[PDB]
Enzyme design. Structure first.
Site, PDB file in Angstrom:
ATOM      1  CG  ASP A   1       6.220   8.444   0.108  1.00 57.29           C
ATOM      2  OD1 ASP A   1       7.241   7.722  -0.076  1.00 57.29           O
ATOM      3  OD2 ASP A   1       5.973   9.011   1.218  1.00 57.29           O
TER       4      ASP A   1
ATOM      5  CG  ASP B   1      11.013   6.114   0.063  1.00 57.60           C
ATOM      6  OD1 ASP B   1       9.772   6.255  -0.417  1.00 57.60           O
ATOM      7  OD2 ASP B   1      11.769   7.031   0.468  1.00 57.60           O
TER       8      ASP B   1
END
Ligand SMILES: COc1ccc([C@]2(C)CCSC(N)=N2)cc1
Ligand code: NA
Ligand code: NA
EC number: 3.4.23.46
Length: 371
Positions: free
Chosen positions: A37, A221
């Site tokens: 992440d 992201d």
């Protein structure tokens, strides 16, 4: 430098549920699958026998575990978790041959966080300390890695859209992209924040104040699936994409991601769909570049049926996996910049490919940044 065969193809995943890498924690090592992440900064792993989890971090089995005597509570828009903080020894088996002492949030209670059916047990936030929980003094995994080893301060991600890909820690692998890498400055070290300076849908500018593109931020992201756009920009963009392909019709809620749509195998009407181009701030004053993505990227297979993989936001623009699957992406933390190049693995066709092109001249790029 330049070649890292051992780390090639070290990521796995389920479409829409993220990409994970295999990690080991504690002594003797306990193997876990961990979500990669770039949109968060905590290394957090399930530490209790939740029914959805294949495995979990059993601290009592680790001689190298150290308690920090500190709890942490982490909510999201939907999910939440709480955990106990500690440090232990961590490795990435298909990564650099190093072990480091890192912070671990042992997740003891969670809600709408772990996915029923998913094969991962934790999350590796690769972003900066500024956004760490509970506060910026909790040293993120990658910081600890760089402080304690001779691993260079950078990593790169090749996400191939069931799913697979590569995370190259401490370097770049040149076989993972074609053409040249173009760099955008990280605007601030918290999320991986960047500045979009222009958006074109099939060649056509949207003629918005570029400040709207970055309201209130734009980020790269890997933990988010979709390209997410600010409401105002989203509205304009669907309007423009609707218009470019009104050759056929689909229900009004499809654009809102409230339903799906289908075609027959062998031939889908790719070409009635427009390319999307984002122009990013470049390394030099008044210089930009653009990345272009195909429909193949924003039309995500579900199971020949597809969901609309662009959706609105109240948090700013989010270049999720949709964008990133077209590109080799370099998080060059050492020089505060993100590099884009056309991925060697990206899903294209005989007609059009994803593209990274420049330089362009864009004036007043600083005005696009929201303060
Ligand atoms: C699939 O499960 C996830 C994925 C990502 C995240 C967070 C930590 C918050 C939502 S968006 C993001 N990139 N990171 C939280 C849970
Ligand atoms: Na170092
Ligand atoms: Na190359």
């Amino acid at each position: 430098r330049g070649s890292f065969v051992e780390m090639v193809d070290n990521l796995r995943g389920k479409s829409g549920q993220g990409y994970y890498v295999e990690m080991t924690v504690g002594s003797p090592p306990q193997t876990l699958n961990i979500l990669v992440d770039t949109g968060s900064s905590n290394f957090a792993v399930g530490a209790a026998p939740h029914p959805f989890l294949h495995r979990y971090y059993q601290r009592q089995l680790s001689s190298t575990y150290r308690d920090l005597r500190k709890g942490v509570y982490v909510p999201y828009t939907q999910g939440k978790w709480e955990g106990e903080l500690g440090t232990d020894l961590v490795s990435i088996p298909h990564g650099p041959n190093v072990t480091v002492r890192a912070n671990i949030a042992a997740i003891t209670e969670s809600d709408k966080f772990f996915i029923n059916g998913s094969n991962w047990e934790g999350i590796l936030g690769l972003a900066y300390a500024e956004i760490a929980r509970p506060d910026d003094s909790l040293e993120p995994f990658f910081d600890s890695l760089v402080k304690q080893t001779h691993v260079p301060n950078l990593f790169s991600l090749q996400l191939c859209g069931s799913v697979g890909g590569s995370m190259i820690i401490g370097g770049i692998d040149h076989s993972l992209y074609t053409g040249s890498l173009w760099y955008t400055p990280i605007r601030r070290e918290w999320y991986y924040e960047v500045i979009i300076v222009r958006v074109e849908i099939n060649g056509q500018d949207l003629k918005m104040d570029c400040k709207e593109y970055n309201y209130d931020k734009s980020i790269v992201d890997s933990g988010t699936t979709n390209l997410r756009l600010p409401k105002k920009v989203f509205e304009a963009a669907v309007a423009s994409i609707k218009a470019a392909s009104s050759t056929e019709k689909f229900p009004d809620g499809f654009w809102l991601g409230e339903q799906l749509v289908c075609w027959q195998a062998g031939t889908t009407p790719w070409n009635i769909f427009p390319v999307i181009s984002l122009y990013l701030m470049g390394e030099v004053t008044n210089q930009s570049f653009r990345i272009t993505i195909l429909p193949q990227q924003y039309l995500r297979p579900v199971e020949d049926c597809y969901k609309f993989a662009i959706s609105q936001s109240s948090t700013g623009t989010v270049m999720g996996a949709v964008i990133m699957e077209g590109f080799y992406v370099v998080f060059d933390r050492a020089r505060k910049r993100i590099g884009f190049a056309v991925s060697a693995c990206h899903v294209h066709d005989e007609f059009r490919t994803a593209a990274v092109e420049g330089p362009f001249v864009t004036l007043d790029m600083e005005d696009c940044g929201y303060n």
